[PDB]
Coordinates of C-alpha atoms in Angstrom, one line a residue:
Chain A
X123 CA -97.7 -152.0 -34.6
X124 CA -95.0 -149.5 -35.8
X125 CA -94.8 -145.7 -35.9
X126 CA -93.1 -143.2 -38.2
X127 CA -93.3 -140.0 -36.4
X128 CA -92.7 -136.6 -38.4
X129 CA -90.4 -133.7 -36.8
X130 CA -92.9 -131.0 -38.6
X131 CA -95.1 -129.7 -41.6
X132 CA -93.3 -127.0 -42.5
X133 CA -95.3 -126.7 -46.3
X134 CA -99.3 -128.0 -47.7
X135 CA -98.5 -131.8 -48.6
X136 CA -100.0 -134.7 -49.3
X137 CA -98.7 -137.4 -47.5
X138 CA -99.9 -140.8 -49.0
X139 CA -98.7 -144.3 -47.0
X140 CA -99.1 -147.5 -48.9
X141 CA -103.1 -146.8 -50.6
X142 CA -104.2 -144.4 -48.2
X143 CA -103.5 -140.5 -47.9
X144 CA -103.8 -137.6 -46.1
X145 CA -104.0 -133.2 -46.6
X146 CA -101.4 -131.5 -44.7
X147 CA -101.4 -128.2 -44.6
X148 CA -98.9 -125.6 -44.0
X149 CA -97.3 -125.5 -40.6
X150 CA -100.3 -127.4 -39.4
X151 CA -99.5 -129.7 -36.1
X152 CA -98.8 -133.0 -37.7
X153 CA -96.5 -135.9 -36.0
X154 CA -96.7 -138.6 -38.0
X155 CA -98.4 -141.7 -38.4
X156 CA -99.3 -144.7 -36.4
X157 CA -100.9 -148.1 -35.9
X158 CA -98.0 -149.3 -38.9
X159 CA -98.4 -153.4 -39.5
X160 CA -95.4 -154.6 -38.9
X161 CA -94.9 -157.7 -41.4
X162 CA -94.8 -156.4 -44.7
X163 CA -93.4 -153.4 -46.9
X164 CA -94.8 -149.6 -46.8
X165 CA -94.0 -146.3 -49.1
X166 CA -94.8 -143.0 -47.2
X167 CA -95.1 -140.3 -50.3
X168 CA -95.4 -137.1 -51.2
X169 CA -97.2 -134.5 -52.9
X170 CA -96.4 -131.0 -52.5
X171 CA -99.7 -128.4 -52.9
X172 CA -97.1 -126.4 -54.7
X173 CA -95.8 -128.8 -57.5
X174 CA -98.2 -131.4 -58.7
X175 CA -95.5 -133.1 -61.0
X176 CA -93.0 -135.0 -58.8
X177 CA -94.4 -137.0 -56.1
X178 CA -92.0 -138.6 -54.2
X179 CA -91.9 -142.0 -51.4
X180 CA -89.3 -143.8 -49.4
X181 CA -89.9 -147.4 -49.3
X182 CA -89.3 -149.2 -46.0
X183 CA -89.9 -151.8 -43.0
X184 CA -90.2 -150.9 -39.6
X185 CA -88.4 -154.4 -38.8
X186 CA -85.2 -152.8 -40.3
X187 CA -84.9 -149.8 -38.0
X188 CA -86.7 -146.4 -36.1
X189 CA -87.5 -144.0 -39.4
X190 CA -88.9 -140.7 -39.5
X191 CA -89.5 -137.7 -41.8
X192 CA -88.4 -134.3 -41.6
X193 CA -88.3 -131.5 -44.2
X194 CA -85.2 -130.2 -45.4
X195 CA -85.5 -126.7 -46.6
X196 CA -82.4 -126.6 -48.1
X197 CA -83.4 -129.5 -51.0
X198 CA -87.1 -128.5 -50.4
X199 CA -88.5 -131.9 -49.5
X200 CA -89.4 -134.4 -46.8
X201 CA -86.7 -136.5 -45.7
X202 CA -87.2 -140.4 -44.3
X203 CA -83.6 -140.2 -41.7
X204 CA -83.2 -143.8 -38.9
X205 CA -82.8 -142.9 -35.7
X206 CA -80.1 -145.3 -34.3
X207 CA -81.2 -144.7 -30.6
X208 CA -84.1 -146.5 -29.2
X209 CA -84.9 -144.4 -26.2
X210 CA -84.6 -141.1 -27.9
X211 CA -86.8 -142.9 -30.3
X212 CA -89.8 -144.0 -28.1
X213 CA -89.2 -141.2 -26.3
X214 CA -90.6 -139.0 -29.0
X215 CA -92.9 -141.3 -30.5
X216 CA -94.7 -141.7 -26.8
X217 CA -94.9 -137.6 -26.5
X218 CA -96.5 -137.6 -29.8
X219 CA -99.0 -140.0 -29.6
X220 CA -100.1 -138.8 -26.0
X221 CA -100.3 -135.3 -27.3
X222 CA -102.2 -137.4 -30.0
X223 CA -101.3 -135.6 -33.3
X224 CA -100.6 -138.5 -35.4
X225 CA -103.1 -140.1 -37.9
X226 CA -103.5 -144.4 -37.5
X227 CA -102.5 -146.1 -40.6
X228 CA -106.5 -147.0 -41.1
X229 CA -106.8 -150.2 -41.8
X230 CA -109.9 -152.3 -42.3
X231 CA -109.5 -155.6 -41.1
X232 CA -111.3 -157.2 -43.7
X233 CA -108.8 -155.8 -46.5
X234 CA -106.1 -157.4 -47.5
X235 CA -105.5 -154.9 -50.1
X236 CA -102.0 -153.9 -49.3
X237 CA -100.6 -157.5 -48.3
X238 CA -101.9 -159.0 -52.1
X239 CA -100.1 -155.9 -53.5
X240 CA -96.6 -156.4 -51.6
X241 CA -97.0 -160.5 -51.5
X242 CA -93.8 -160.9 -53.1
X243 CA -92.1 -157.3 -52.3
X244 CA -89.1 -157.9 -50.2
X245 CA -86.9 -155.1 -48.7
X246 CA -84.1 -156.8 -49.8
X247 CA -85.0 -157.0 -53.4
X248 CA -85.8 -153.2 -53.2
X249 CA -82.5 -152.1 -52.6
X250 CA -81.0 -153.9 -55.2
X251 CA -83.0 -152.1 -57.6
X252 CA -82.7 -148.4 -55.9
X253 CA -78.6 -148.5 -55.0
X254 CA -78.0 -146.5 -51.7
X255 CA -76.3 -148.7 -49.3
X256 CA -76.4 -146.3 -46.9
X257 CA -79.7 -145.7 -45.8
X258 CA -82.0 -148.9 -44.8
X259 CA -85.1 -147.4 -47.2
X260 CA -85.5 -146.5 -50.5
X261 CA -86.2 -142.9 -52.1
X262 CA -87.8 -143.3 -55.4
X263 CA -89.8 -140.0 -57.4
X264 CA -91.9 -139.5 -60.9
X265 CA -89.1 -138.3 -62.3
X266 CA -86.3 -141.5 -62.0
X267 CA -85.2 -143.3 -65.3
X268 CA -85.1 -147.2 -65.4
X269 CA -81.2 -149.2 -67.0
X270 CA -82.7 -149.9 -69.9
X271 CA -84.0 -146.3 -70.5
X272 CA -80.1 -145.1 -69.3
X273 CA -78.9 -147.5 -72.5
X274 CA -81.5 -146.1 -74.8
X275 CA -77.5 -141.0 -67.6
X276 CA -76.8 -140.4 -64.1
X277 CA -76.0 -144.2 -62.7
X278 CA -76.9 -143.4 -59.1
X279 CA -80.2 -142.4 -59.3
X280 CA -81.0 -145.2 -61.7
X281 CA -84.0 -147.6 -60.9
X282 CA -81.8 -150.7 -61.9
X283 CA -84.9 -153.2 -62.8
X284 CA -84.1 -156.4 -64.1
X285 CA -83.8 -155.9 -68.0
X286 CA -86.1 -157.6 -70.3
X287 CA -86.0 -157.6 -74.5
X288 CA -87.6 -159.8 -76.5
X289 CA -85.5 -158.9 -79.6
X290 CA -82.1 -160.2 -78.0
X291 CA -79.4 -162.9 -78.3
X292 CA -80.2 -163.9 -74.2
X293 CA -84.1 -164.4 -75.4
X294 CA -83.4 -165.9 -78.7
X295 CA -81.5 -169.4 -78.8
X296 CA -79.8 -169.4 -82.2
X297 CA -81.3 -171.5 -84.4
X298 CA -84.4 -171.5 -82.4
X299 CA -84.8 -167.5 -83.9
X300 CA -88.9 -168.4 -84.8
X301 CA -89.8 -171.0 -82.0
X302 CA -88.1 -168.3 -79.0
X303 CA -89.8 -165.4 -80.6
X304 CA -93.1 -166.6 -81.3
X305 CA -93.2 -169.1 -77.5
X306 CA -90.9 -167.2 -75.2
X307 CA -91.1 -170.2 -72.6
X308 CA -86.7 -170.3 -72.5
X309 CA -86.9 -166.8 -71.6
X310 CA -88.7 -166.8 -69.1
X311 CA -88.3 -170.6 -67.1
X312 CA -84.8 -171.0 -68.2
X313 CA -83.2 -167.5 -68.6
X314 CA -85.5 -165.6 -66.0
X315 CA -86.7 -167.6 -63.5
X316 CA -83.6 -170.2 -63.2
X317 CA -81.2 -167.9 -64.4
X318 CA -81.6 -164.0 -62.8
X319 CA -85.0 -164.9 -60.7
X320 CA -83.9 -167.8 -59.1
X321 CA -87.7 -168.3 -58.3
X322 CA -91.2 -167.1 -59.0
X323 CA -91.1 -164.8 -55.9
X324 CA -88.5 -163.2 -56.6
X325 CA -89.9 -162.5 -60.3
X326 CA -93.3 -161.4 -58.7
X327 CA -91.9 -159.3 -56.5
X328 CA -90.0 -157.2 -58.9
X329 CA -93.1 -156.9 -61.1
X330 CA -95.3 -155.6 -57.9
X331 CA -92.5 -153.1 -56.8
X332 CA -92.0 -151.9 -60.5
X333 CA -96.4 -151.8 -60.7
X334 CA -96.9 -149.9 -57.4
X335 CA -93.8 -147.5 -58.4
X336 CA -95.8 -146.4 -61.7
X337 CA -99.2 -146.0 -59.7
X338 CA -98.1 -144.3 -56.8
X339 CA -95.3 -141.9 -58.5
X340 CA -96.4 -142.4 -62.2
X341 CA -92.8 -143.6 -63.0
X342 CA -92.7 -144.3 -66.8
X343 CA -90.4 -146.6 -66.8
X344 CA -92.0 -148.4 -64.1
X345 CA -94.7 -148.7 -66.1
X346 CA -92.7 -150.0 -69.0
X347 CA -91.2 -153.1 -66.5
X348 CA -94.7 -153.9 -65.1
X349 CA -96.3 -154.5 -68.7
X350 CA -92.4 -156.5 -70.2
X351 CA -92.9 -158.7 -66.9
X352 CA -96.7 -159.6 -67.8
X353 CA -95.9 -159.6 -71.4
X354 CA -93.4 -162.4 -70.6
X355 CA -94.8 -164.7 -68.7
X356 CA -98.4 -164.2 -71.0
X357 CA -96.3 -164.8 -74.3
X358 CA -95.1 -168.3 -72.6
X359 CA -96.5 -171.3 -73.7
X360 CA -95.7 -173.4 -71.0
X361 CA -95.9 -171.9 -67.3
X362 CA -95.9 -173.6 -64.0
X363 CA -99.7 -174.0 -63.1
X364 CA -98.9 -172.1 -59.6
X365 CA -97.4 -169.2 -61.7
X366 CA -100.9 -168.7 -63.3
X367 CA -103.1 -169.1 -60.7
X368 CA -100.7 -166.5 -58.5
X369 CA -100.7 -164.0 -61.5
X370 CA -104.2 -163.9 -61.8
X371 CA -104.8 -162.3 -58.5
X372 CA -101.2 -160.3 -58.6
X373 CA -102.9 -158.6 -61.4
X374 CA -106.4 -158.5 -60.4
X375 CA -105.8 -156.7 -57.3
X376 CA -103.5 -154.1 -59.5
X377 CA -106.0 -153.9 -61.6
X378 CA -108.9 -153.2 -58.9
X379 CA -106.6 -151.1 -56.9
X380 CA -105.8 -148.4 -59.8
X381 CA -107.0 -145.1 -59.8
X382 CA -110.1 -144.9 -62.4
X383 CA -109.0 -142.1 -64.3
X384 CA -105.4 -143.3 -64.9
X385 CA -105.9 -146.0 -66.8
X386 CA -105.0 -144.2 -70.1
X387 CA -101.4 -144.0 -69.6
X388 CA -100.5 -147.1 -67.1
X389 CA -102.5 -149.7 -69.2
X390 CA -100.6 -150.5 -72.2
X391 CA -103.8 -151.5 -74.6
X392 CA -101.5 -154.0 -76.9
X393 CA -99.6 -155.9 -73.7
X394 CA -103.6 -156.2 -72.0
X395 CA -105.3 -157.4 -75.6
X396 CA -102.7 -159.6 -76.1
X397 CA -102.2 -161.8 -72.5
X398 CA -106.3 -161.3 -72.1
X399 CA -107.0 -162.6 -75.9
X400 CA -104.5 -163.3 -78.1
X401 CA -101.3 -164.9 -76.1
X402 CA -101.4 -168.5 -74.8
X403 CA -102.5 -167.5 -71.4
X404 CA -105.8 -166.1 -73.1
X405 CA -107.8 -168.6 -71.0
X406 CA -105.6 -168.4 -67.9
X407 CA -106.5 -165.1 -66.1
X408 CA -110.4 -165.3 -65.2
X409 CA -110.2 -163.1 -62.4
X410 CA -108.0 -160.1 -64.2
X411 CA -110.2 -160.6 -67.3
X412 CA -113.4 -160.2 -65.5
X413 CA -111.9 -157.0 -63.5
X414 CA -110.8 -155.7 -66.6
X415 CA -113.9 -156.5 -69.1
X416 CA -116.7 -154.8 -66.4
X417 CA -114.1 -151.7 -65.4
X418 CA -112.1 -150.5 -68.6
X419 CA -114.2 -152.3 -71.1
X420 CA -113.4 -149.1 -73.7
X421 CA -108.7 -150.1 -73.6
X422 CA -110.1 -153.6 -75.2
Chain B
X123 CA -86.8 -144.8 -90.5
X124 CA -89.2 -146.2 -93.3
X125 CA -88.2 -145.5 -96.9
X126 CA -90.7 -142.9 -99.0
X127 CA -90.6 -140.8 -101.8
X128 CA -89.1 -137.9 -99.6
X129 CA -85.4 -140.4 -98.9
X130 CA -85.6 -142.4 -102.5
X131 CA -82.1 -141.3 -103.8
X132 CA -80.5 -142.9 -100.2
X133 CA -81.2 -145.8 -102.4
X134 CA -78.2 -144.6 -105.0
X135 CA -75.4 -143.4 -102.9
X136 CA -72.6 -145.6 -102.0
X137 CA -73.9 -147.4 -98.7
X138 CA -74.2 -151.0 -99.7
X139 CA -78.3 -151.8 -98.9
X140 CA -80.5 -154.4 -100.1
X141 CA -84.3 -154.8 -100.8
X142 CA -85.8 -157.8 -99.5
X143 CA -89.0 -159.3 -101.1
X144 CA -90.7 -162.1 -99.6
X145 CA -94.1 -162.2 -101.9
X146 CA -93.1 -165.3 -104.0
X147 CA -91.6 -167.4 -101.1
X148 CA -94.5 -169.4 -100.3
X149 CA -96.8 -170.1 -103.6
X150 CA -99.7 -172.2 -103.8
X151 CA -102.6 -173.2 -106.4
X152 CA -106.2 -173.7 -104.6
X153 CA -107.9 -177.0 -105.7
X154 CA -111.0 -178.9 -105.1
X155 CA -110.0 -182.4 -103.5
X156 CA -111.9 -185.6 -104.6
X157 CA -114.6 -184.6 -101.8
X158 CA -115.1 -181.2 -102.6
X159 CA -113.0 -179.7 -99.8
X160 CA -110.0 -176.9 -100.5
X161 CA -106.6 -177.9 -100.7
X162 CA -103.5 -176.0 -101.6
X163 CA -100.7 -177.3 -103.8
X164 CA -97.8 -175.6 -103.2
X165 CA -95.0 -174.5 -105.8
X166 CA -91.4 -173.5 -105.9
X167 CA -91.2 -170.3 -104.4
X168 CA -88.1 -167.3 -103.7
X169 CA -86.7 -164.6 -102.0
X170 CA -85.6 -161.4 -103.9
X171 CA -82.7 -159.9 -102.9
X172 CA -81.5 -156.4 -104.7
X173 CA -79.0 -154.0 -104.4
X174 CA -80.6 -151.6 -106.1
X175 CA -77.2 -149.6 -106.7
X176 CA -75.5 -152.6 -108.4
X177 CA -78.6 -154.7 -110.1
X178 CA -77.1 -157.6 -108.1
X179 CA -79.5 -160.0 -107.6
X180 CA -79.5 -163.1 -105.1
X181 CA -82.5 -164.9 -105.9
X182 CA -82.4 -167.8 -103.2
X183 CA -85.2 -170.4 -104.8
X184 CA -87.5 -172.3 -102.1
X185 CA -88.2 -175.8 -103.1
X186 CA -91.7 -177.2 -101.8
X187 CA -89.8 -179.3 -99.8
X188 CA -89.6 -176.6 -97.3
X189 CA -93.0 -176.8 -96.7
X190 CA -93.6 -180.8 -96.3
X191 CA -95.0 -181.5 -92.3
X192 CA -94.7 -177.6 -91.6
X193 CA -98.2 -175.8 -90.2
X194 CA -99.1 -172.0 -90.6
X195 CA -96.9 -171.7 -93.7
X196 CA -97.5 -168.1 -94.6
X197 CA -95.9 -167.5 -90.8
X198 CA -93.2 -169.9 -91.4
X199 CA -92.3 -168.8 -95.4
X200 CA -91.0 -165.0 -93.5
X201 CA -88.9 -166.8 -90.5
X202 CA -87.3 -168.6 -93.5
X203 CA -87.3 -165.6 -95.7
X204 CA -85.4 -163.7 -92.8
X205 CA -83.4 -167.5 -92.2
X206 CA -81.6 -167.2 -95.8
X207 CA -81.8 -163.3 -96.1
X208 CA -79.6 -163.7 -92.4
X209 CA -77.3 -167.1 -94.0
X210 CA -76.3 -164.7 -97.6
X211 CA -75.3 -161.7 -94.9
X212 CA -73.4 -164.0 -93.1
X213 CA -72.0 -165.7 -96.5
X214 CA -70.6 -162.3 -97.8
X215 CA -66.9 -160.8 -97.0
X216 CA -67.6 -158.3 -94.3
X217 CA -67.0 -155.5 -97.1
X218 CA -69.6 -156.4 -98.9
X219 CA -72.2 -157.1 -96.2
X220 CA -75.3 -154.2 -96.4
X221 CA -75.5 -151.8 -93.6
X222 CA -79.6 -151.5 -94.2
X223 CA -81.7 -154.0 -95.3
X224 CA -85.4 -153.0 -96.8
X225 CA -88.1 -155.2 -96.7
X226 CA -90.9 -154.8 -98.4
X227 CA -93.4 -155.6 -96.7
X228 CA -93.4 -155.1 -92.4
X229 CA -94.2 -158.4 -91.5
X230 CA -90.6 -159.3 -92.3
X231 CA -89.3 -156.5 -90.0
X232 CA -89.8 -158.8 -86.3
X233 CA -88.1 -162.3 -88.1
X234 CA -85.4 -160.3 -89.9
X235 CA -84.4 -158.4 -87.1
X236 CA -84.2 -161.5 -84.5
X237 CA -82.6 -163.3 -87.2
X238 CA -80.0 -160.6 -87.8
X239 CA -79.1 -160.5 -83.9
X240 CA -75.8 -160.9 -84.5
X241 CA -75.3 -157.5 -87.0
X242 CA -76.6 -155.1 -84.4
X243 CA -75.0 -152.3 -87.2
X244 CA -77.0 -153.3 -89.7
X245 CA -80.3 -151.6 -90.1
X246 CA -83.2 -153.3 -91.0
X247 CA -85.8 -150.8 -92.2
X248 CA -89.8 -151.0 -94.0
X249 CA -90.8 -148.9 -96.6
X250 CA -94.1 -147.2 -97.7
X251 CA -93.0 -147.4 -101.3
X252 CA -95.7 -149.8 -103.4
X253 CA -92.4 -151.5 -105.0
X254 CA -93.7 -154.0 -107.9
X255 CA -90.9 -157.0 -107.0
X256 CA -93.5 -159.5 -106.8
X257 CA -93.9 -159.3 -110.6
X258 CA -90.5 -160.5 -110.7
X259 CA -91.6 -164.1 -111.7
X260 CA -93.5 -162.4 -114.5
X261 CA -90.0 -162.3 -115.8
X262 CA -89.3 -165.4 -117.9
X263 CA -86.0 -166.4 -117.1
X264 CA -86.5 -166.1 -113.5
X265 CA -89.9 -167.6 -113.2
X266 CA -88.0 -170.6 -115.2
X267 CA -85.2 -171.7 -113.1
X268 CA -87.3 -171.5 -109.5
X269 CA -90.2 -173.6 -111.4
X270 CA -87.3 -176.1 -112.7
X271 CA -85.6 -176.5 -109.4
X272 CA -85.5 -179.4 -107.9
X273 CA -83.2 -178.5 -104.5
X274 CA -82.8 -175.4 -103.1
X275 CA -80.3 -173.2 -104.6
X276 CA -79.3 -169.8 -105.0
X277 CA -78.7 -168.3 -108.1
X278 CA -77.6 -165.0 -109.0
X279 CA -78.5 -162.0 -111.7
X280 CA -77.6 -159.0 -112.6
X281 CA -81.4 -157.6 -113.2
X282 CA -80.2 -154.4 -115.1
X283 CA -78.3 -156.3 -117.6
X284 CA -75.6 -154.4 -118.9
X285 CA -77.9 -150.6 -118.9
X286 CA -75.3 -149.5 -116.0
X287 CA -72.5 -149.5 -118.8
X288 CA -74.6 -146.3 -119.9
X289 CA -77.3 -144.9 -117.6
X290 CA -77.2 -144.4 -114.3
X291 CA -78.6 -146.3 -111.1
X292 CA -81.5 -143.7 -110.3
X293 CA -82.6 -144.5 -114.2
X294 CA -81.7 -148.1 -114.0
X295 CA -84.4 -148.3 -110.7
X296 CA -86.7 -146.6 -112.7
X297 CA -86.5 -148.6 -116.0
X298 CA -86.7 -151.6 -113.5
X299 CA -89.5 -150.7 -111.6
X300 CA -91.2 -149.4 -115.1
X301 CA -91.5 -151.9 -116.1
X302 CA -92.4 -155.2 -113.4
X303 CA -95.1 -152.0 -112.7
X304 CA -96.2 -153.1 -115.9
X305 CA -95.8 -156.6 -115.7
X306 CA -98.1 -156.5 -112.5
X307 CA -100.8 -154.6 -114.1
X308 CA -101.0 -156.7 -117.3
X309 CA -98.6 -158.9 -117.9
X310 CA -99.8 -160.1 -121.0
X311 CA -99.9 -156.3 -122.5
X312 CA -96.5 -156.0 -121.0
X313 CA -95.0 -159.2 -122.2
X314 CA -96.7 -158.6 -125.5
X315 CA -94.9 -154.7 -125.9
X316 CA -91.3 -156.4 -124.9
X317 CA -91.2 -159.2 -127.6
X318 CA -93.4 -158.2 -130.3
X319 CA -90.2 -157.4 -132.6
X320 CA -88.4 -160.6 -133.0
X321 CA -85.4 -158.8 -134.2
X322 CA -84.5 -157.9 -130.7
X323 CA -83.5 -160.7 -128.8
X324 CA -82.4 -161.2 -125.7
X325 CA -78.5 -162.3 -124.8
X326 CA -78.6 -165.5 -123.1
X327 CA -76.3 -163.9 -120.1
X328 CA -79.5 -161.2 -119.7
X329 CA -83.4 -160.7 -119.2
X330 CA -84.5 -158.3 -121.1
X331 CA -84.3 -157.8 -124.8
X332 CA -81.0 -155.6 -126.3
X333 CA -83.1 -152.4 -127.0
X334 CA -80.9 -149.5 -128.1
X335 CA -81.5 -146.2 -126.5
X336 CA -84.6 -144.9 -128.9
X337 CA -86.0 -148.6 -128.7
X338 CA -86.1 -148.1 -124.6
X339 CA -87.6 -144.8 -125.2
X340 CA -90.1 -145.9 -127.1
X341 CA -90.5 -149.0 -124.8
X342 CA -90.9 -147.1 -121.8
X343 CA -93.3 -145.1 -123.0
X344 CA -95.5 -148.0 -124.4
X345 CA -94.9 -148.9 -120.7
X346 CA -96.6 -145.9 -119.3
X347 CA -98.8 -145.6 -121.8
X348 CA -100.3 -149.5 -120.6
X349 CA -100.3 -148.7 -116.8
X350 CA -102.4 -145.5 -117.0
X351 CA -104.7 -147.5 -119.6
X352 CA -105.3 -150.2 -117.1
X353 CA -105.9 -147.5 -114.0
X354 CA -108.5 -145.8 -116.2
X355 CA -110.3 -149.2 -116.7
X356 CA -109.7 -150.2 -112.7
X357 CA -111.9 -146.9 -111.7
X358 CA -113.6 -146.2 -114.3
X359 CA -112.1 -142.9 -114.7

């Protein structure tokens, strides 16, 4: 069990950490939050009671280093900073928890919510896709533009996804124009997956990372990578049988762990009708269609 | 964006663009077979390619060939309409390569564009226009060398004859559209107006008959004249 103790409260927040949040309010006694599981990634966020548009997170594991959060009035925001000195870094942490101002990361132990929404999510991967070398987590807000929404400005604040486009010379063999475009199964086993992937994981960990980013900050373009990376794989005539099977619950725990009255502008009603109905892998996702059918019935 | 009424002249400037009809590429008759089932026979088909500027015609003739051991034809007639459309780009000088292709109908936009890949600067681009270029095998000539083919082969027409050598493009469209309108509605009316006087003939290098000026006025207005008839009789109006 980890800890991510807070210096203050300084302004009314709400602090989410993976699914779960939290009220603040202002200058109220809070320290942070405990009973972390070690073992897979997190995302502390933000909400300010001031400014409902931009909520704001770090990603992170506690196996990479001591973090905390502390506001910065200057940029107006809470701050994750590492601690590079253990005992300092107990030694608050201890205080804190005997003076017993810190929430516990409230896990049921019959959920396994969190770990099927992070299977594939590796820290690694994160920071490939958020650039900032110099910090061992990864800031990411509403408000951050994707590569492929930079083509069509600022570099370093980019969320450099792994870029997808079914109308281009990489997903289109020439002289295989109709076959590529109609069964995109080069694209995704040859170019994707052997190519930029290297393997499935890899793959499904981009798409959970790019899913949770447009639920838990409503990140457009997030949204935008989720659906292309579903799209893909559903518009694929020939997938390995594990692939399936693993997508299935990747998407039916997305699916189930969505906020109900969101699901206008993260579902994309074409990319849904078409894996569920019309693509290949119509008969493939029994579990998502189910979840889907008996919750959003009115998007199909 | 889509072409409408509001950006029709763009059609008559000076940037090379062609119109790219796809109606006629895959033709069939319906039949009973010796059990009573449907079958389709198909015939020789084409794409129609204009510059509407120039009359230039490139009218690439399908041969049922095409078609033999092939499934979901109608799919398959616009990936091979966009195939040639892509090949007689490629086949130009660079010069005189289009910098917007219009199709007529959106189900060519997806297969034209992946087909034209490789000219990322050349726009590809629907319409909402009701263009009448499927009538264009109402025209004899032209319905005469695709149904005589017996490979594929392109073969090319001016479709204004020589009216450019005294109106302009904007009028030459309009004559043109005029009258495959026509032909659509009633061809036979229509064929009937164009060659009832057989003093005005039709130069073997052309398609229409040599009207003089007065003769196309009064053509054109036997034109109109047939396709509000025919709209009065479709609505009872």
């Amino acid at each position: 069990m980890n800890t991510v103790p807070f210096t203050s409260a300084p302004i009314e927040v709400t602090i989410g950490i993976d699914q779960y949040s939290f009220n603040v309010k202002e200058n109220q006694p809070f320290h942070g939050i405990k009973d972390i599981p070690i073992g897979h990634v997190h995302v502390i966020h933000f909400q300010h009671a001031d400014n409902s548009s931009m909520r704001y997170g770090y990603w992170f594991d506690c196996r990479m280093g001591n973090f905390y959060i502390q506001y910065d009035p200057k940029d107006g925001l809470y701050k994750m900073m590492e601690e590079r000195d253990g005992a300092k870094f107990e030694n608050i942490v201890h205080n804190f928890k005997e003076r017993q101002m810190m929430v516990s990361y409230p896990k049921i132990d019959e959920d396994d919510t969190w770990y099927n929404l992070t299977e594939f999510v590796q820290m690694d991967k994160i920071r490939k896709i958020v650039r900032k070398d110099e910090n061992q987590f990864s800031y990411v807000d509403s408000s951050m533009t994707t590569v492929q929404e930079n083509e069509l400005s600022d570099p370093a604040h980019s969320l450099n996804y792994t870029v997808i486009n079914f109308k281009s010379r990489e997903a289109i063999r020439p002289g295989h124009e109709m076959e590529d475009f109609l069964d995109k199964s080069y694209y995704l086993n040859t170019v994707m997956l052997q190519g930029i992937f290297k393997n499935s994981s890899n793959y499904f960990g981009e798409l959970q990372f790019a899913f949770l980013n447009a639920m838990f900050f409503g990140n457009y373009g997030s949204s935008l990578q989720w659906h292309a990376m579903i799209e893909l794989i559903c518009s694929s005539a020939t997938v390995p049988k594990h692939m399936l099977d693993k997508l299935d619950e990747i998407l039916y725990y997305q699916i189930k762990t969505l906020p109900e009255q969101y699901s206008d502008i993260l579902l994309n009603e074409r990319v849904w009708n078409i894996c569920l109905y019309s693509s290949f892998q119509k008969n493939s996702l029994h579990n998502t269609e189910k979840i889907m059918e008996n919750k959003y019935p009115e998007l199909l | 964006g889509a072409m409408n009424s509001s950006n029709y002249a763009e059609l008559f400037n000076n940037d090379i663009k062609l119109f790219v009809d796809d109606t006629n590429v895959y033709r069939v008759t319906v039949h009973k077979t010796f059990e009573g089932n449907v079958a389709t026979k198909a015939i020789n088909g084409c794409i129609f390619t204009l510059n509407p500027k120039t009359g230039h015609l490139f009218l690439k003739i399908i041969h049922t060939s095409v078609w033999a051991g092939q499934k979901r034809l109608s799919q398959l007639a616009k990936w091979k309409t966009a195939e040639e459309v892509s090949a007689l780009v490629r086949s130009l000088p660079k010069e005189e390569q289009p910098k917007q292709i219009i199709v007529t109908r959106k189900a060519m936009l997806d297969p034209l564009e992946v087909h034209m890949l490789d000219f990322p600067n050349i726009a590809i681009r629907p319409t909402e226009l009701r263009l009448p270029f499927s009538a264009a095998m109402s025209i004899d000539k032209l319905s005469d060398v695709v149904m005589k083919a017996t490979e594929p082969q392109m073969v090319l027409f001016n479709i204004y004859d020589d009216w450019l050598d005294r109106i302009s493009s904007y009028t030459a469209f309009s004559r043109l559209t005029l009258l495959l309108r026509a032909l659509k509605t009633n061809e036979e009316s229509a064929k009937m107006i164009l060659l009832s006087d057989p003093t005005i003939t039709i130069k073997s290098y052309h398609l229409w008959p040599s009207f003089t000026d007065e003769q196309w006025i009064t053509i054109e207005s036997q034109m109109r004249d047939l396709i509000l008839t025919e709209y009065g009789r479709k609505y009872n109006v």
